[PDB]
Design an enzyme around this catalytic site. Structure first.
Site, short mmCIF file in Angstrom:
data_model
loop_
_atom_site.label_atom_id
_atom_site.label_comp_id
_atom_site.label_asym_id
_atom_site.label_seq_id
_atom_site.Cartn_x
_atom_site.Cartn_y
_atom_site.Cartn_z
N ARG A 203 0.84 -1.20 0.00
CA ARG A 203 0.00 0.00 0.00
C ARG A 203 0.88 1.26 0.00
NH1 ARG A 203 -3.01 -3.12 3.80
NH2 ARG A 203 -4.89 -3.89 2.76
N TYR B 165 -5.48 1.34 -12.08
CA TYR B 165 -5.26 0.60 -10.84
C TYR B 165 -4.24 -0.52 -10.91
CZ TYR B 165 -6.27 -2.11 -6.68
OH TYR B 165 -6.11 -2.74 -5.47
N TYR C 32 -0.01 -1.27 -9.15
CA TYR C 32 0.56 -2.38 -8.39
C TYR C 32 1.72 -3.05 -9.12
CZ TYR C 32 -2.97 -1.10 -5.26
OH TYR C 32 -3.75 -0.30 -4.46
#
Ligand SMILES: [Fe+3]
Ligand SMILES: [Mg+2]
Ligand SMILES: [Mg+2]
Ligand SMILES: [Mg+2]
Lengths: 197, 212
Positions: B56, B72, B76
Protein backbone atom coordinates in the site's frame (compact mmCIF):
# COMPACT_ATOMS: atom_id res chain seq x y z
CA UNK A 1 5.15 20.72 -17.59
CA UNK A 2 2.99 18.12 -15.81
CA UNK A 3 3.61 15.62 -18.65
CA UNK A 4 3.52 11.86 -18.15
CA UNK A 5 6.87 10.06 -17.78
CA UNK A 6 8.10 7.91 -20.66
CA UNK A 7 6.99 4.31 -20.14
CA UNK A 8 7.25 1.02 -22.02
CA UNK A 9 3.84 -0.59 -22.68
CA UNK A 10 2.31 -1.83 -19.44
CA UNK A 11 2.07 -5.42 -20.67
CA UNK A 12 5.80 -5.36 -21.38
CA UNK A 13 6.51 -4.00 -17.90
CA UNK A 14 4.27 -6.48 -16.11
CA UNK A 15 5.75 -9.50 -17.96
CA UNK A 16 9.26 -8.09 -17.39
CA UNK A 17 8.56 -8.14 -13.65
CA UNK A 18 7.35 -11.75 -13.94
CA UNK A 19 10.35 -12.86 -16.00
CA UNK A 20 12.88 -11.08 -13.75
CA UNK A 21 11.57 -12.92 -10.69
CA UNK A 22 10.80 -16.22 -12.40
CA UNK A 23 14.29 -16.34 -13.95
CA UNK A 24 15.78 -16.21 -10.44
CA UNK A 25 13.78 -19.19 -9.24
CA UNK A 26 11.59 -16.99 -7.02
CA UNK A 27 8.21 -17.90 -8.48
CA UNK A 28 7.08 -21.51 -7.97
CA UNK A 29 5.89 -23.54 -10.96
CA UNK A 30 2.27 -22.68 -11.75
CA UNK A 31 2.10 -20.05 -9.04
CA UNK A 32 0.70 -17.02 -10.91
CA UNK A 33 -1.54 -19.32 -12.96
CA UNK A 34 -2.95 -20.77 -9.71
CA UNK A 35 -3.67 -17.30 -8.34
CA UNK A 36 -5.32 -16.27 -11.59
CA UNK A 37 -7.69 -19.28 -11.34
CA UNK A 38 -8.47 -18.48 -7.68
CA UNK A 39 -9.21 -14.87 -8.52
CA UNK A 40 -11.38 -15.75 -11.51
CA UNK A 41 -13.21 -18.82 -10.40
CA UNK A 42 -13.20 -19.07 -6.55
CA UNK A 43 -13.43 -15.53 -5.19
CA UNK A 44 -16.96 -14.67 -6.20
CA UNK A 45 -20.05 -12.65 -5.21
CA UNK A 46 -22.02 -15.87 -5.67
CA UNK A 47 -20.59 -16.80 -2.22
CA UNK A 48 -21.83 -13.62 -0.56
CA UNK A 49 -25.20 -14.16 -2.25
CA UNK A 50 -25.34 -17.67 -0.71
CA UNK A 51 -24.65 -16.17 2.71
CA UNK A 52 -27.39 -13.53 2.28
CA UNK A 53 -29.97 -16.11 1.16
CA UNK A 54 -29.09 -18.31 4.14
CA UNK A 55 -29.46 -15.32 6.52
CA UNK A 56 -32.81 -14.40 4.96
CA UNK A 57 -34.25 -17.89 5.51
CA UNK A 58 -32.46 -18.88 8.80
CA UNK A 59 -32.86 -16.48 11.75
CA UNK A 60 -30.17 -18.29 13.75
CA UNK A 61 -27.63 -17.98 10.94
CA UNK A 62 -28.66 -14.31 10.41
CA UNK A 63 -27.84 -13.59 14.03
CA UNK A 64 -24.47 -15.35 13.74
CA UNK A 65 -23.56 -13.54 10.51
CA UNK A 66 -24.35 -10.17 12.16
CA UNK A 67 -22.48 -10.86 15.41
CA UNK A 68 -19.55 -13.01 14.27
CA UNK A 69 -19.29 -12.74 10.52
CA UNK A 70 -15.96 -14.54 10.44
CA UNK A 71 -17.46 -17.62 12.11
CA UNK A 72 -20.50 -17.59 9.80
CA UNK A 73 -18.35 -17.35 6.67
CA UNK A 74 -16.04 -20.06 8.03
CA UNK A 75 -18.98 -22.51 8.21
CA UNK A 76 -19.08 -22.26 4.41
CA UNK A 77 -15.32 -22.42 4.06
CA UNK A 78 -15.15 -18.97 2.42
CA UNK A 79 -12.48 -17.26 4.57
CA UNK A 80 -9.47 -16.26 2.50
CA UNK A 81 -6.97 -13.54 1.56
CA UNK A 82 -8.56 -10.08 2.05
CA UNK A 83 -11.40 -11.87 3.84
CA UNK A 84 -10.22 -13.18 7.16
CA UNK A 85 -12.06 -10.81 9.57
CA UNK A 86 -15.56 -10.36 8.24
CA UNK A 87 -18.27 -7.98 9.41
CA UNK A 88 -21.72 -8.06 7.79
CA UNK A 89 -23.74 -4.83 8.14
CA UNK A 90 -27.52 -4.96 8.17
CA UNK A 91 -29.77 -2.72 6.12
CA UNK A 92 -33.07 -1.85 7.83
CA UNK A 93 -36.15 0.24 6.96
CA UNK A 94 -34.23 3.29 8.23
CA UNK A 95 -30.63 2.45 7.25
CA UNK A 96 -28.75 1.80 4.03
CA UNK A 97 -25.10 0.68 4.23
CA UNK A 98 -22.48 1.17 1.51
CA UNK A 99 -18.84 0.05 1.42
CA UNK A 100 -15.77 1.76 -0.06
CA UNK A 101 -11.97 1.79 0.29
CA UNK A 102 -11.25 5.50 -0.11
CA UNK A 103 -7.49 4.92 0.22
CA UNK A 104 -7.19 2.11 -2.41
CA UNK A 105 -9.64 -0.73 -3.14
CA UNK A 106 -10.00 -2.92 -0.08
CA UNK A 107 -12.81 -5.42 -0.50
CA UNK A 108 -13.86 -8.78 0.98
CA UNK A 109 -12.36 -10.66 -2.00
CA UNK A 110 -13.43 -14.26 -1.26
CA UNK A 111 -17.14 -13.49 -0.87
CA UNK A 112 -17.60 -10.39 -3.05
CA UNK A 113 -15.00 -11.15 -5.73
CA UNK A 114 -12.16 -8.80 -6.62
CA UNK A 115 -13.40 -5.24 -6.88
CA UNK A 116 -14.52 -3.94 -10.26
CA UNK A 117 -12.96 -0.96 -12.01
CA UNK A 118 -15.72 1.41 -10.92
CA UNK A 119 -15.23 0.66 -7.20
CA UNK A 120 -11.52 1.44 -7.57
CA UNK A 121 -12.24 4.64 -9.48
CA UNK A 122 -11.18 8.00 -8.12
CA UNK A 123 -14.79 9.12 -8.63
CA UNK A 124 -16.20 6.51 -6.23
CA UNK A 125 -13.31 6.82 -3.73
CA UNK A 126 -13.64 10.62 -3.55
CA UNK A 127 -17.42 11.01 -3.71
CA UNK A 128 -19.28 8.18 -1.94
CA UNK A 129 -17.95 9.13 1.51
CA UNK A 130 -19.26 12.72 1.15
CA UNK A 131 -22.32 12.44 -1.12
CA UNK A 132 -23.42 8.82 -1.06
CA UNK A 133 -27.08 9.66 -1.77
CA UNK A 134 -26.22 11.48 -5.01
CA UNK A 135 -23.68 8.79 -6.03
CA UNK A 136 -26.23 6.01 -5.50
CA UNK A 137 -28.88 8.02 -7.35
CA UNK A 138 -26.60 8.51 -10.34
CA UNK A 139 -25.83 4.77 -10.27
CA UNK A 140 -29.59 3.90 -10.44
CA UNK A 141 -30.51 3.50 -6.73
CA UNK A 142 -32.82 5.97 -5.07
CA UNK A 143 -32.57 6.19 -1.29
CA UNK A 144 -35.30 8.23 0.32
CA UNK A 145 -34.57 10.98 2.81
CA UNK A 146 -36.24 8.83 5.52
CA UNK A 147 -33.24 6.55 5.37
CA UNK A 148 -29.82 7.14 6.97
CA UNK A 149 -26.96 6.24 4.63
CA UNK A 150 -23.94 4.85 6.40
CA UNK A 151 -20.69 4.49 4.50
CA UNK A 152 -18.10 2.02 5.78
CA UNK A 153 -14.59 3.03 4.69
CA UNK A 154 -12.39 -0.12 4.62
CA UNK A 155 -9.30 1.40 6.17
CA UNK A 156 -7.91 -1.56 8.16
CA UNK A 157 -8.41 -5.33 8.23
CA UNK A 158 -12.18 -5.58 8.68
CA UNK A 159 -13.70 -6.77 5.41
CA UNK A 160 -17.35 -5.96 4.96
CA UNK A 161 -20.41 -7.25 3.24
CA UNK A 162 -23.89 -5.67 3.20
CA UNK A 163 -26.84 -7.78 4.27
CA UNK A 164 -29.57 -6.05 2.21
CA UNK A 165 -33.23 -6.03 3.20
CA UNK A 166 -35.21 -8.89 1.72
CA UNK A 167 -37.68 -7.51 -0.84
CA UNK A 168 -41.38 -8.12 -0.83
CA UNK A 169 -42.59 -10.60 -3.39
CA UNK A 170 -39.97 -13.24 -2.37
CA UNK A 171 -41.94 -14.94 0.42
CA UNK A 172 -41.33 -18.66 0.40
CA UNK A 173 -38.57 -18.56 -2.25
CA UNK A 174 -35.89 -21.18 -2.03
CA UNK A 175 -32.29 -20.25 -1.11
CA UNK A 176 -31.34 -20.75 -4.78
CA UNK A 177 -34.07 -18.39 -5.98
CA UNK A 178 -33.05 -15.77 -3.41
CA UNK A 179 -29.34 -16.08 -4.25
CA UNK A 180 -30.04 -15.14 -7.84
CA UNK A 181 -31.28 -11.63 -6.96
CA UNK A 182 -28.36 -10.84 -4.62
CA UNK A 183 -25.79 -9.30 -6.94
CA UNK A 184 -22.25 -8.08 -6.39
CA UNK A 185 -23.58 -4.53 -6.22
CA UNK A 186 -26.06 -5.52 -3.50
CA UNK A 187 -23.17 -6.91 -1.41
CA UNK A 188 -21.14 -3.69 -1.87
CA UNK A 189 -24.30 -1.73 -1.03
CA UNK A 190 -24.89 0.44 -4.07
CA UNK A 191 -27.86 -1.69 -5.27
CA UNK A 192 -31.02 -3.06 -3.67
CA UNK A 193 -32.08 -6.64 -4.64
CA UNK A 194 -34.74 -6.52 -7.41
CA UNK A 195 -37.67 -8.85 -7.81
CA UNK A 196 -38.94 -9.48 -11.43
CA UNK A 197 -42.29 -8.04 -12.52
CA UNK B 1 1.16 10.51 4.22
CA UNK B 2 -1.03 13.38 2.97
CA UNK B 3 -0.76 12.15 -0.62
CA UNK B 4 -3.10 12.43 -3.54
CA UNK B 5 -4.29 8.87 -2.81
CA UNK B 6 -6.21 10.27 0.18
CA UNK B 7 -9.20 11.04 -2.04
CA UNK B 8 -12.23 10.86 0.23
CA UNK B 9 -13.95 14.24 0.22
CA UNK B 10 -12.13 15.65 -2.81
CA UNK B 11 -14.55 17.65 -4.96
CA UNK B 12 -14.67 18.03 -8.73
CA UNK B 13 -14.86 14.42 -9.91
CA UNK B 14 -17.64 13.37 -12.27
CA UNK B 15 -19.92 10.36 -12.38
CA UNK B 16 -18.86 6.99 -11.14
CA UNK B 17 -18.43 4.91 -14.36
CA UNK B 18 -21.12 2.32 -13.51
CA UNK B 19 -24.82 1.88 -13.17
CA UNK B 20 -26.15 -0.81 -10.87
CA UNK B 21 -25.74 -4.40 -12.08
CA UNK B 22 -24.17 -3.31 -15.35
CA UNK B 23 -21.76 -5.63 -17.01
CA UNK B 24 -18.28 -5.27 -15.50
CA UNK B 25 -16.76 -7.80 -17.93
CA UNK B 26 -14.21 -10.45 -16.92
CA UNK B 27 -12.18 -10.29 -13.73
CA UNK B 28 -9.09 -9.42 -15.79
CA UNK B 29 -9.42 -7.24 -18.88
CA UNK B 30 -5.88 -7.90 -20.11
CA UNK B 31 -3.66 -10.97 -19.99
CA UNK B 32 -1.12 -9.38 -17.61
CA UNK B 33 -3.56 -8.06 -14.98
CA UNK B 34 -3.35 -11.05 -12.62
CA UNK B 35 0.43 -10.52 -12.32
CA UNK B 36 0.61 -7.64 -9.81
CA UNK B 37 -1.42 -9.42 -7.11
CA UNK B 38 0.11 -12.82 -7.84
CA UNK B 39 3.65 -11.43 -7.63
CA UNK B 40 2.71 -9.41 -4.55
CA UNK B 41 1.70 -12.72 -2.90
CA UNK B 42 4.95 -14.31 -4.03
CA UNK B 43 6.74 -11.43 -2.33
CA UNK B 44 4.78 -11.58 0.91
CA UNK B 45 4.11 -15.27 1.36
CA UNK B 46 6.87 -17.10 -0.53
CA UNK B 47 9.85 -14.74 -0.35
CA UNK B 48 9.00 -12.90 2.91
CA UNK B 49 10.38 -9.79 1.23
CA UNK B 50 7.73 -7.27 2.27
CA UNK B 51 4.34 -6.92 3.93
CA UNK B 52 1.01 -6.07 2.32
CA UNK B 53 1.23 -2.73 4.16
CA UNK B 54 4.51 -1.98 2.34
CA UNK B 55 2.64 -2.57 -0.96
CA UNK B 56 0.00 0.00 0.00
CA UNK B 57 2.72 2.49 0.97
CA UNK B 58 4.83 2.04 -2.14
CA UNK B 59 1.74 2.80 -4.27
CA UNK B 60 1.17 5.92 -2.14
CA UNK B 61 4.76 6.85 -3.00
CA UNK B 62 4.15 7.05 -6.73
CA UNK B 63 4.90 10.56 -7.96
CA UNK B 64 1.51 12.32 -7.65
CA UNK B 65 0.87 13.05 -11.34
CA UNK B 66 2.02 9.50 -12.15
CA UNK B 67 -0.47 8.09 -9.63
CA UNK B 68 -3.31 10.15 -11.08
CA UNK B 69 -2.79 8.98 -14.67
CA UNK B 70 -2.12 5.29 -13.96
CA UNK B 71 -4.80 2.60 -14.02
CA UNK B 72 -5.26 0.60 -10.84
CA UNK B 73 -3.56 -2.70 -11.69
CA UNK B 74 -0.60 -0.87 -13.30
CA UNK B 75 -0.03 1.02 -10.04
CA UNK B 76 0.56 -2.38 -8.39
CA UNK B 77 2.96 -3.49 -11.17
CA UNK B 78 4.91 -0.32 -10.48
CA UNK B 79 4.65 -0.73 -6.69
CA UNK B 80 5.71 -4.40 -6.54
CA UNK B 81 8.60 -3.71 -8.99
CA UNK B 82 9.69 -0.81 -6.79
CA UNK B 83 9.73 -2.94 -3.67
CA UNK B 84 11.71 -5.68 -5.44
CA UNK B 85 14.37 -3.09 -6.34
CA UNK B 86 14.38 -1.46 -2.90
CA UNK B 87 14.70 -4.84 -1.16
CA UNK B 88 17.70 -5.76 -3.39
CA UNK B 89 15.95 -8.62 -5.22
CA UNK B 90 15.81 -6.99 -8.64
CA UNK B 91 17.58 -4.08 -10.33
CA UNK B 92 15.90 -1.33 -12.33
CA UNK B 93 18.40 -2.05 -15.13
CA UNK B 94 17.17 -5.58 -15.54
CA UNK B 95 13.52 -4.54 -15.38
CA UNK B 96 14.07 -1.97 -18.14
CA UNK B 97 16.16 -4.35 -20.21
CA UNK B 98 13.44 -7.00 -20.06
CA UNK B 99 10.65 -4.48 -20.64
CA UNK B 100 12.43 -2.97 -23.62
CA UNK B 101 12.06 0.59 -22.36
CA UNK B 102 11.47 2.88 -19.42
CA UNK B 103 10.06 1.51 -16.19
CA UNK B 104 9.87 4.43 -13.77
CA UNK B 105 9.26 3.44 -10.14
CA UNK B 106 7.70 4.97 -7.08
CA UNK B 107 9.68 7.64 -5.31
CA UNK B 108 11.90 6.87 -2.31
CA UNK B 109 10.27 7.10 1.10
CA UNK B 110 10.80 10.33 2.96
CA UNK B 111 9.96 8.78 6.33
CA UNK B 112 11.39 5.89 8.31
CA UNK B 113 7.92 5.26 9.74
CA UNK B 114 7.00 5.24 13.41
CA UNK B 115 6.53 2.57 16.06
CA UNK B 116 3.28 1.34 17.50
CA UNK B 117 2.46 3.90 20.19
CA UNK B 118 3.40 2.92 23.75
CA UNK B 119 0.40 4.66 25.34
CA UNK B 120 -3.04 3.78 24.07
CA UNK B 121 -6.48 3.09 25.52
CA UNK B 122 -8.78 0.09 25.22
CA UNK B 123 -12.14 1.57 24.23
CA UNK B 124 -15.62 0.08 24.68
CA UNK B 125 -18.65 0.15 22.37
CA UNK B 126 -20.58 3.41 22.88
CA UNK B 127 -17.57 5.44 24.03
CA UNK B 128 -16.75 8.78 22.41
CA UNK B 129 -13.28 9.04 20.88
CA UNK B 130 -11.34 11.66 18.96
CA UNK B 131 -8.93 10.84 16.18
CA UNK B 132 -5.52 12.05 17.32
CA UNK B 133 -4.57 15.36 15.71
CA UNK B 134 -1.29 14.09 14.33
CA UNK B 135 0.53 14.31 11.01
CA UNK B 136 2.43 11.24 9.79
CA UNK B 137 4.60 11.63 6.65
CA UNK B 138 4.96 7.84 6.15
CA UNK B 139 2.24 5.27 5.88
CA UNK B 140 -0.91 5.67 7.97
CA UNK B 141 -4.39 4.11 7.70
CA UNK B 142 -6.19 7.25 8.79
CA UNK B 143 -7.88 9.24 5.95
CA UNK B 144 -7.42 12.96 6.57
CA UNK B 145 -11.17 13.66 6.65
CA UNK B 146 -11.37 12.12 10.14
CA UNK B 147 -8.16 13.64 11.69
CA UNK B 148 -9.18 15.52 14.88
CA UNK B 149 -12.85 14.53 14.55
CA UNK B 150 -15.09 12.89 17.18
CA UNK B 151 -17.14 9.79 16.78
CA UNK B 152 -18.52 6.80 18.72
CA UNK B 153 -17.20 3.27 18.96
CA UNK B 154 -19.48 0.71 17.27
CA UNK B 155 -17.03 -2.27 17.38
CA UNK B 156 -13.69 -3.28 18.86
CA UNK B 157 -12.11 -6.07 16.85
CA UNK B 158 -11.48 -9.38 18.55
CA UNK B 159 -8.19 -9.72 16.68
CA UNK B 160 -5.11 -7.50 16.63
CA UNK B 161 -2.74 -6.56 13.84
CA UNK B 162 0.61 -4.83 13.36
CA UNK B 163 0.45 -1.03 13.36
CA UNK B 164 0.49 0.07 9.69
CA UNK B 165 2.76 3.06 10.30
CA UNK B 166 5.54 0.66 11.36
CA UNK B 167 4.87 -2.51 9.26
CA UNK B 168 4.30 -0.40 6.11
CA UNK B 169 7.96 0.61 6.44
CA UNK B 170 9.24 -2.89 7.24
CA UNK B 171 10.03 -1.89 10.87
CA UNK B 172 10.48 -4.35 13.75
CA UNK B 173 8.33 -2.40 16.20
CA UNK B 174 4.81 -2.60 14.81
CA UNK B 175 3.53 -4.56 17.83
CA UNK B 176 -0.17 -5.36 17.60
CA UNK B 177 -3.34 -3.43 18.19
CA UNK B 178 -7.05 -3.99 17.68
CA UNK B 179 -8.98 -1.61 15.46
CA UNK B 180 -12.26 0.17 16.15
CA UNK B 181 -15.25 0.90 13.96
CA UNK B 182 -15.70 4.62 14.71
CA UNK B 183 -18.99 6.13 13.59
CA UNK B 184 -18.92 9.80 12.66
CA UNK B 185 -21.90 11.94 11.84
CA UNK B 186 -21.62 13.20 8.25
CA UNK B 187 -21.83 16.81 9.52
CA UNK B 188 -18.85 16.16 11.85
CA UNK B 189 -16.70 15.39 8.76
CA UNK B 190 -18.09 17.74 6.09
CA UNK B 191 -20.30 20.32 7.89
CA UNK B 192 -23.32 21.20 5.75
CA UNK B 193 -21.62 20.02 2.52
CA UNK B 194 -22.68 16.37 2.47
CA UNK B 195 -25.89 14.43 1.69
CA UNK B 196 -25.05 11.39 3.84
CA UNK B 197 -25.85 10.21 7.32
CA UNK B 198 -22.85 8.62 8.97
CA UNK B 199 -19.40 7.32 8.02
CA UNK B 200 -17.72 4.44 9.86
CA UNK B 201 -13.92 4.40 9.72
CA UNK B 202 -11.96 1.32 10.90
CA UNK B 203 -9.22 2.95 12.97
CA UNK B 204 -6.25 1.39 14.77
CA UNK B 205 -6.24 1.98 18.54
CA UNK B 206 -3.06 4.11 18.20
CA UNK B 207 -4.95 6.70 16.11
CA UNK B 208 -7.52 7.34 18.86
CA UNK B 209 -7.83 9.15 22.20
CA UNK B 210 -10.68 9.70 24.63
CA UNK B 211 -12.88 12.57 23.51
CA UNK B 212 -13.00 15.83 25.53
FE1 LIG C 1 -8.11 -0.72 -0.66
MG1 LIG D 1 -5.14 15.39 1.78
MG1 LIG E 1 18.11 5.28 -15.86
MG1 LIG F 1 2.45 9.55 31.34
Amino acid sequence: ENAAPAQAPVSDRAWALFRALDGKGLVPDGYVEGWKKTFEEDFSPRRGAELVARAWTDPEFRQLLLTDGTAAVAQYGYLGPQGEYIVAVEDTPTLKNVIVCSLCACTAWPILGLPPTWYKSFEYRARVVREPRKVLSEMGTEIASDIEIRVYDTTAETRYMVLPQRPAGTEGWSQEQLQEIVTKDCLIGVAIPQVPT
Amino acid sequence: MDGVHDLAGVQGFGKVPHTVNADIGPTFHAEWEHLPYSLMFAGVAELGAFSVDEVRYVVERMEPRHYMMTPYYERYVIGVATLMVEKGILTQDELESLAGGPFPLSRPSESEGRPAPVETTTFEVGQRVRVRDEYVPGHIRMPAYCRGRVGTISHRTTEKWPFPDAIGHGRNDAGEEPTYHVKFAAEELFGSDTDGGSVVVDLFEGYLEPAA
